[PDB]
Protein backbone atom coordinates (compact mmCIF):
# COMPACT_ATOMS: atom_id res chain seq x y z
CA UNK A 1 0.00 0.00 0.00
CA UNK A 2 1.20 3.60 -0.61
CA UNK A 3 -0.36 6.43 1.30
CA UNK A 4 0.25 9.98 0.14
CA UNK A 5 -1.37 12.29 2.61
CA UNK A 6 -2.27 16.01 2.50
CA UNK A 7 -3.10 16.33 6.22
CA UNK A 8 -4.93 19.25 7.78
CA UNK A 9 -5.47 19.26 11.56
CA UNK A 10 -7.68 21.31 13.83
CA UNK A 11 -7.40 20.72 17.53
CA UNK A 12 -9.94 22.26 19.90
CA UNK A 13 -11.12 20.45 23.04
CA UNK A 14 -10.84 17.04 21.35
CA UNK A 15 -7.83 17.60 19.05
CA UNK A 16 -9.69 16.52 15.85
CA UNK A 17 -7.95 16.58 12.48
CA UNK A 18 -8.90 16.29 8.77
CA UNK A 19 -6.48 14.93 6.15
CA UNK A 20 -6.40 14.07 2.48
CA UNK A 21 -5.29 10.53 1.75
CA UNK A 22 -4.60 8.15 -1.17
CA UNK A 23 -3.42 4.62 -0.58
CA UNK A 24 -1.92 2.82 -3.50
CA UNK A 25 -2.50 -0.84 -3.32
CA UNK A 26 -0.80 -3.50 -5.38
CA UNK A 27 -3.29 -5.96 -6.87
CA UNK A 28 -2.29 -9.29 -5.31
CA UNK A 29 -3.01 -9.46 -1.58
CA UNK A 30 -5.79 -7.93 0.52
CA UNK A 31 -4.90 -4.54 2.09
CA UNK A 32 -3.32 -4.77 5.54
CA UNK A 33 -4.91 -3.29 8.67
CA UNK A 34 -1.72 -1.71 10.03
CA UNK A 35 -0.29 -0.78 6.64
CA UNK A 36 -3.29 1.35 5.64
CA UNK A 37 -4.47 2.37 9.12
CA UNK A 38 -1.06 3.07 10.52
CA UNK A 39 0.47 4.69 7.45
CA UNK A 40 -2.82 6.58 7.02
CA UNK A 41 -2.89 8.10 10.56
CA UNK A 42 0.80 8.18 11.12
CA UNK A 43 1.26 9.99 7.85
CA UNK A 44 -1.93 11.77 8.71
CA UNK A 45 0.09 13.62 11.22
CA UNK A 46 -0.97 11.30 14.01
CA UNK A 47 -0.43 7.95 15.76
CA UNK A 48 -2.26 4.63 15.25
CA UNK A 49 -4.62 5.37 18.14
CA UNK A 50 -5.74 8.54 16.40
CA UNK A 51 -6.80 6.72 13.20
CA UNK A 52 -10.47 7.01 12.26
CA UNK A 53 -11.16 6.90 8.50
CA UNK A 54 -14.64 6.78 6.95
CA UNK A 55 -15.63 7.29 3.33
CA UNK A 56 -13.09 7.47 0.52
CA UNK A 57 -13.37 9.59 -2.65
CA UNK A 58 -11.74 7.59 -5.47
CA UNK A 59 -10.26 9.89 -8.13
CA UNK A 60 -7.90 8.42 -10.76
CA UNK A 61 -9.34 5.29 -12.33
CA UNK A 62 -6.23 3.20 -11.69
CA UNK A 63 -6.23 1.18 -8.47
CA UNK A 64 -5.61 3.54 -5.55
CA UNK A 65 -8.12 5.15 -3.22
CA UNK A 66 -8.39 8.77 -2.17
CA UNK A 67 -10.58 10.48 0.37
CA UNK A 68 -10.63 12.15 3.72
CA UNK A 69 -9.51 10.60 6.96
CA UNK A 70 -10.46 11.57 10.47
CA UNK A 71 -8.08 11.30 13.42
CA UNK A 72 -8.44 11.24 17.20
CA UNK A 73 -5.49 12.17 19.41
CA UNK A 74 -7.48 11.56 22.61
CA UNK A 75 -7.50 7.80 21.97
CA UNK A 76 -3.99 7.27 23.47
CA UNK A 77 -4.36 9.76 26.31
CA UNK A 78 -7.61 8.06 27.31
CA UNK A 79 -6.04 4.61 27.06
CA UNK A 80 -3.11 5.60 29.27
CA UNK A 81 -5.32 7.07 32.00
CA UNK A 82 -8.30 4.83 31.21
CA UNK A 83 -11.75 6.46 30.71
CA UNK A 84 -13.21 4.33 33.51
CA UNK A 85 -10.63 5.66 35.97
CA UNK A 86 -11.35 8.42 38.48
CA UNK A 87 -9.70 11.40 36.79
CA UNK A 88 -11.27 14.03 39.06
CA UNK A 89 -15.06 13.92 38.84
CA UNK A 90 -16.08 17.58 38.91
CA UNK A 91 -15.61 19.13 35.49
CA UNK A 92 -13.97 22.35 34.32
CA UNK A 93 -14.99 25.98 34.80
CA UNK A 94 -12.69 28.35 32.89
CA UNK A 95 -15.39 30.96 32.23
CA UNK A 96 -17.12 28.40 29.97
CA UNK A 97 -17.49 24.63 29.67
CA UNK A 98 -17.12 24.85 25.89
Residues 82, 43: contact at Cβ < 8 Å? no
DSSP lists the bridge partners of residue 20 as 6, 68
Reference 45, options 81, 25, 72; nearest CA is 72
Architecture field, domain 1-98: 2-Layer Sandwich (3.30)
Cα separation, 38 vs 77, in Å, equals 17
Q: How many residues does the chain have?
A: 98
Amino acid sequence: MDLIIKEKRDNPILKRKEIKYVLKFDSSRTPSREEIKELIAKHEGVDKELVIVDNNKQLTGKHEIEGYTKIYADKPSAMLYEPDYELIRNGLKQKEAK
